[PDB]
Amino acid sequence: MEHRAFKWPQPLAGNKPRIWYGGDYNPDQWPEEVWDEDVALMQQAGVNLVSVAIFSWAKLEPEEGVYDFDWLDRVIDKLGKAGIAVDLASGTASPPMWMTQAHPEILWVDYRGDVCQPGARQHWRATSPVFLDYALNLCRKMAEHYKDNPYVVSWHVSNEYGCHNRFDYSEDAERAFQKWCEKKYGTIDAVNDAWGTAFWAQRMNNFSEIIPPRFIGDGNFMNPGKLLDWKRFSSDALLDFYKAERDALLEIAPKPQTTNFMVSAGCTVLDYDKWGHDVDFVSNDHYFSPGEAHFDEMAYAACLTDGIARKNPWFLMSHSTSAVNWRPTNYRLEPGELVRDSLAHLAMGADAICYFQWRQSKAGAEKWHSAMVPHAGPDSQIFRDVCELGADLNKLADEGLLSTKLVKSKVAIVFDYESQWATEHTATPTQEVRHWTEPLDWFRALADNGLTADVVPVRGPWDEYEAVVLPSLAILSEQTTRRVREYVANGGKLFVTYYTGLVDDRDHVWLGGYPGSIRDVVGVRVEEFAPMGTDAPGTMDHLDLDNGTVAHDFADVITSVADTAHVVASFKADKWTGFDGAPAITVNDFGDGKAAYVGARLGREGLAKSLPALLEELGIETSAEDDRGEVLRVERADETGENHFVFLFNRTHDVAVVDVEGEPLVASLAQVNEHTAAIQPNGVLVVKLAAALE
Amino acid sequence: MEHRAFKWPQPLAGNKPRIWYGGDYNPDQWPEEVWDEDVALMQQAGVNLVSVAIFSWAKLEPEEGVYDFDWLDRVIDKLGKAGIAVDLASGTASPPMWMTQAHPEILWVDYRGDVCQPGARQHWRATSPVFLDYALNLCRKMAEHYKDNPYVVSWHVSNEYGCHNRFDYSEDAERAFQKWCEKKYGTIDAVNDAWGTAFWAQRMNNFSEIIPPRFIGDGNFMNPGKLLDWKRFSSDALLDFYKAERDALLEIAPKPQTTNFMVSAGCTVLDYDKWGHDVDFVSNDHYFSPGEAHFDEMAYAACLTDGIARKNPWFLMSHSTSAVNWRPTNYRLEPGELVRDSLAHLAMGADAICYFQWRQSKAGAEKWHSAMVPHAGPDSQIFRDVCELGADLNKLADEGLLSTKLVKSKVAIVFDYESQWATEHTATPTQEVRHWTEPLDWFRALADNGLTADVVPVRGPWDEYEAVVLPSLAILSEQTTRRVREYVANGGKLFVTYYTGLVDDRDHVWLGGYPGSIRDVVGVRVEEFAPMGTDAPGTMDHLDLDNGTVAHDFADVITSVADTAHVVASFKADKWTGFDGAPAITVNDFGDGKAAYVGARLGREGLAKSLPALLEELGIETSAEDDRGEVLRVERADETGENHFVFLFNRTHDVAVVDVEGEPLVASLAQVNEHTAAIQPNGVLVVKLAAALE
Ligand SMILES: CC(=O)N[C@H]1[C@H](O[C@H]2[C@@H](O)[C@@H](CO)O[C@@H](O[C@H]3[C@H](O)[C@@H](O)[C@H](O)O[C@@H]3CO)[C@@H]2O)O[C@H](CO)[C@@H](O)[C@@H]1O[C@@H]1O[C@H](CO)[C@H](O)[C@H](O)[C@H]1O
Ligand SMILES: CC(=O)N[C@H]1[C@H](O[C@H]2[C@@H](O)[C@@H](CO)O[C@@H](O[C@H]3[C@H](O)[C@@H](O)[C@H](O)O[C@@H]3CO)[C@@H]2O)O[C@H](CO)[C@@H](O)[C@@H]1O[C@@H]1O[C@H](CO)[C@H](O)[C@H](O)[C@H]1O
C-alpha cells in the first residue's frame, strides 16, 4: 500500500528528453584503448545511456578497505563528454573473492546444508548481517564519490535480486524467518492455525521451533502454508536488503533509482508488484521465449510490467539483440525481430530501451550471449539493426511518444504472484496446473479476437475495468472476495476459470463447494475436480465440449447451476466418465453485472473459439473482421489524447494487410499505401493518429 | 515361520458383528463443535468404526512428560455413545517438534550424510535407542489410560512403517547392520562369501569394516549381495520396532492389534509376508492406480493381501473415496467406482472397509486428498455414495458374509518380496525387468481367460495348488528349488517364466545354464539373454512368436530342449538376430506333472492369447465362453459352503451381460432379470448362492 513518487532519469545538461537507448557497458572487461571505439560506435548507433559497474566490486574494492575509482571516473568522463548518460550501479550485485574467503558466513546455504560457493554470481544470503555491512559500505563510497557527477543520471541498485539467491536455509535465514513469522502472526498459536499444524504432529510450542523448510527426503511433502510463507519471506528478505541499499545511496546522492526486475509470464522468484512499490521507476529484464509464443509472451510480460508500473513509464533495462546463452538451445532472432521486439516493449509503455549488453564478451560465461556489437564487430546485420533502431527511437520521441501511456483496455487480466506460489506445492490436484499459464492464455485468446488486454496485479485497480478475468487465481482473500462480489454487483463483467478461489490467503480451503467464497457470484457449485493426463495407459486425457473445443489437463465437476445462470457449453464424453452432458461453461446474472465461469483448461485455442459467444453475452464489443487476430494493436496516448500512437504487430507467418489510420512513423518489414499497409511476418508499423480525425 | 493366533476387533457391548466400516478420524483438526455433526453424519452413513489419534503425539504429549488425554477421552466417549467403535492408535507414528529439537540424533540420515529434517512425517531412525524410549513411553501411557475403555476395540500401532523411513544410513544403522550381519552369518568369512567380496578388493577382515551402502558416486554399482541384505535388514529393523511397540501396548492393554501395510502390485518397501507373521490381523492401505489397470491391480493387491493373510479375514484400513493428493496428476474416481472398489477388497476377503479419511482437511498437506465428507460437505455425490456403501455392507453382513473366506483358486501365482529386491540392482541384464510386474501380468491374463488366480507369497502353501506360476521369480533357494521339483514330480502343473531361478538366496548365480537349479524340471537350458528396447537407433525392440504374440524387453536364448519336452511356440525374427525358429514357449513332462516355460515377456495381452493351448496341455479347465474375460468373478464361502457369495465385476468399457446364478444382494451400475444381468462399465453385482442348488 503506497507507491513511491515517480522519478525518471533526467537528460544531461543541454539535452532534450529522449527515449533512453543503450545497455549494460562493461569497459572493465576490455583494454582502455577500446573505449574510444565504443563511444564512436555508440554515437553512430544513437546510444544515449549505458549501465556501468554492475558487477565491478572486485575492481572498485580490489581488497578490503582499498578503493580504485579512477578507471570508472575516466570511463564516465568519456561517455558524458560524448553526450552519453550513465546509469550507475551500486556495484554490490556480487561479492569479490577476498570477501567470501574472509567471510564464508556470507554464502547462501541450500536445503541440504550445502554451501553455495563462489564461481558464478550472487552467492550471498539475503539475511547476512555481514554481507549487509559490506554492501552498504560500498554503496556509501560510490554515492560519496559520484554524488556531484553530472553524467550520472540514475542508480541501478544491485542486479536482479533473487535470480540465484532467492532461497537460503542458513542459521541467518532461520532466525530471520522466525522474526518474520512473529511480526506477521504475533503468537505461535496464530502460526499453528495459519499453517494447519494439527496434522502430522507438526504443532509448535514456540517460535524457536520454526525452522526453514529444509530437506525432508526427496519426494516428501512440505507443509503448504509454511512453504507459501517461506516464499513470501524470501521475497521480503531480499526487498528489505534492496531498501537498505537504496536508502544508503539516496541519503548521500539522491538520484532516480531502480532495481531490475525479471517480469515474464512464468517468473515469480519475487512478488514483483510488491517490489514495484519501492522503486522510483520500474525497470525490467526480459528475454524472448523461443518458438511460436515469442511475440505474444513478450507483449504479455511488457503489459504486466506496465501494470506493475500502474501505467507510469517504465524502463526496459535488458533484452537481447539475438541469442541468449543460458537455454539448452539458444535460438537466434530472425530478421526484423530485433527492432520488432524492442518496439513491443515500447508499445507497452517503456520510455527506455536497453540491452544486455553493449559489446559481446570474448571470454567468461557470457561470451556466447548476443550483444549490440557482436564478436563479428560493427560490420554485422546486428549492429546495423541496432543503428536503425536508434534512429527509429529518436524519431518517435521527436513526434511526442515520451510520457504517453499505455491506453486503458476494456479487459483486465488479474495476476497474483502469491497464487502462483500456492499452485506450486507438490500435493495439489495436478502438477500440470499452475496459476501463471492461464492469464497468458487469456491474453493470447483475447488477442485472437482482436482485443488487447491489460494485465493488472491483484492489488491494482482491476475493479475499475469494463471486464475482468480471474485466471486460475487460486487464492481469494476475504478482501479480494469482497472486491469481486462488489465489482460484479455494480455492473462488472467477470470471467472466472477453474482453479480460482480455492483457498484464502493462508491456503485454507473455502468450504461448501468451489469456488467457495464466490459461488453466489458465479452461480455454480463444483464438488471435485477431474485432472487429465497421459501418465498411464487408459487415463482420461481430454474432454470435448459441444462448442467445438477440447479441454485438457483439468476439468471441474459442476453439480449445480443457479436459476439466475445458464449453461453455454457442455462436455461431450463417454458415458462412464460421468461427463456426458455436464456443464462446462456458464454465465450468471448477479446484481447489475455478469460472471462467466470456464470450468476447464481450454488453452489459447479453445478460449479464442469460446470467446465470441461469451463476449457477446457480457456486452463486450470487439472488431467483427475475419482478420481480427492477425495483428496486435497497441496504443499509447497522453491524458488529452492529442498525442496518440498505434503500434501494429503481425502475430502470424502470413502477410497481414491492415487499414492504416494515421501518419506512419516507423515501418519494419512493412509497406504502406489509400490508408493500407502490408505487414510481413515479424513486421511492425507505428502510426501517429491525427487528433482532429477519427 | 509361525503366525500369531488370529484376532479381530470385537463389536461393542450390545452390537452384533458387522463389516467394520469407516476410516481415519482426525477430530483434533477441527473445533469441538464439529464433532457432534461428524457423529450424526457417521450414523447416517452407517459408519461403525473409526481410527483415531494416528499422528496426535504433539497433542497427547504437548511437551516432554506432559500428557493431555482429555480431548480424546471426550471424542471417544461421543463416538462410543453413538455406537461407533474406535480403533485407537499408539500415537507414535511421527514425533513432535519439541522432541526432534531436543534430540536431533532421532532423525534419519540419507546415503550422503544429510539429515532428514522435520517438516513432513516419520523422520525417525528405526534403530534410534532414543526414539525407541520415547515411543514405548507413549505406548505405555496410552495403554494405561485406555486399557479399561470399552469403546476401544483395537490398536493401530504407528502408521505405515517405512513409507518415509525405510532407509537410514546413520551411525545407529551402521552398528545395527553389523549386528544383524553377525547374527545372520556368524563369521566375517561367511559375509565375505555371501557378498562375493573377492571382487574390487572388497574383502573384509572383521565386522567393524561393514558399513551401510552409503554414497559411492551417482551411477556407480553397489555390491548386490550387500544391497539385498541392506533391504532385508531395513525391513527387519522396522519390524523389531513394531514388535516392541506392540508388546509394550499388549502387556498393559491386550486388544486385537495390527499395523497398516502398503500392499500393492509394485510396493516392496517391506517384506510384508514376513510382517504378516507379527500382526494379529492383517490390515492394508491401498490406493487405486490410474487408467486401464485401476480395477485389475486393485483386485490383485487385495488378492495378495488375502494371501499374506493365509485366507483369514483382513482389514482394509485405507483407500480413497476419489482422488489422492500425492501423484503428479491426481485423477478422480468415475461414477460407481467408490462402491465398486470397496467391494473389490471385500470380495477378496476383507471384513472391514475404511478410508483415509472421514472429513477432508481444510488445511495442511492433505487438504486435496478426497474424504468421506468432502470440502463440499454432505450434500455431495461422494457422501451419498458413502451412505449407499454403508447400507450395502450392512446388507451383506445380514446375509452371512462375515468370516466367509476367499475361495481356493486353481492357480497360485507366487510372489517374493526378496526376488523383487534382487531384480532392483543397477547391473542386471536390464532395468526394464523387475519381479513385480510379471505376477500382475499373469493375474490379468488368467482373468482374460476366465480364471481368478490366488496370489500366494513364496513362504505360503502354493505347492498345494492345482497349478502354480513362477513369474520372474529371480531367486530360488535350495529349499524352494526342492519344493518346486517335488511339487511337479507329484502331479503339479507349473508355469515358469524368464528371469526365474537365476540366483539363490544370496544372489549367487545357479551355474550350468539358466534356470540353473531346475533345468530338469522345465526341460530347457538357457545360455544367455536378449534384452530388448529402444535406447538407440536400430536396437532390437521386439520378437514375434509364431502363435501370433509379440515379446518385448527380454527374451531367453534357449539352446536345448529335453526329450520329455516339446516346443509350443517359436520366435520369428530376421535371420541375423539368431532368433528365427528359436524356441519361445515349451512344455515338459516331469514325473506325474508338467512344467511350461515362457521364455520371454509377452505382457498381459501376449500371455492371455498364449494361455488356451497351455491351459489345455496342463489339463487346467476353464469356461469356454467368448465373453470369459469381460467380468472378474470372485467367490467367498464358509468351510461348509452353505454361505457362498459371488462378486461380479465388469473389467471393460462395454455393457457385460452375465448368467446370474443366485439371489442378487447388491447391484451398483447393474440391472438384473430369467437369471440374467447387464453390468455397466465400473459396475458390480453381488449374489448369494442357494446352497441346495448348483
Ligand atoms: C531475466 C532473466 O532471464 N535473467 C536471468 C535468468 O533468469 C531465470 C532465473 O530467474 C530462473 C530461476 O527460477 O527462472 C527463469 O525464469 C523461468 C521461470 O522461472 C519459469 O517458470 C518459466 O517457465 O521459464 C522462465 C525462463 O524462460 C529466469 O528467467 O537466468 C539466467 C541463467 O542463470 C541468467 O543468465 C539471466 O540473467 C541475465 O544474464 C545475462 C547473461 O549472463 C546477463 O548477466 C544479464 O545481466 C542478466 O539479465
Ligand atoms: C499405501 C500408500 O500409498 N501410502 C503412502 C504412499 O506410498 C508410497 C511410498 O511407499 C513410496 C515409497 O517407495 O512407494 C509407493 O509405491 C509405489 C511403488 O514403490 C512403485 O514400485 C509402484 O510402481 O508405484 C507405487 C505407487 O503407486 C507408495 O505407494 O506415499 C504417499 C506419498 O508420500 C503417501 O501420501 C501415502 O500414504 C497415505 O497418505 C495419505 C495422505 O497424506 C494419508 O496420510 C494416509 O494416512 C496414508 O495411507
Residue numbers in the entry:
A (entry chain A), B (entry chain A): 1 to 673, 676 to 696
Question: Can you provide the manuscript's text about this entry?
Answer:
BiBga42A has a three-dimensional structure similar to other GH42 enzymes that have three domains consisting of a (β/α)8 barrel (domain A), an α/β fold (domain B), and an anti-parallel β-sandwich (domain C). Glu-160 and Glu-318 in BiBga42A were predicted to be the acid/base catalyst and the nucleophile, respectively, based on previous studies of GH42 enzymes and sequence alignment.
An LNT-complexed crystal was indeed obtained for the mutant, and the structure was determined at 2.2 Å resolution (E318S-LNT). The asymmetric unit of the E318S-LNT crystal contained two molecules (chains A and B) of BiBga42A, and they are virtually the same (Cα RMSD = 0.106 Å). The electron density map of LNT was clearly visible at the active site. The pyranose sugar ring of the Gal moiety in subsite -1 adopts a slightly distorted conformation toward OH5, and the C6 hydroxymethyl group takes a gg rotamer conformation. The carboxyl group of Glu-160 is suitably poised for proton donation to the leaving group as it is located 3.3 Å from the glycosidic bond oxygen of the LNB (Galβ1-3GlcNAc) unit in LNT. The C1 atom of the Gal moiety at subsite -1 in E318S-LNT has moved away from the side chain of Ser-318 with a distance of 6.2 Å. In addition, the C1 atom was located 4.3 Å from the nearest side chain oxygen atom (Oε1) of the superimposed Glu-318 of WT-GOL, and the configuration was not suitable for the in-line nucleophilic attack to the anomeric carbon. The sugar ring of the GlcNAc in subsite +1 forms a stacking interaction with the side chain of Trp-326. The nitrogen atom of the N-acetyl group is recognized by a direct hydrogen bond with the carboxyl group of Glu-160 (the catalytic acid/base).
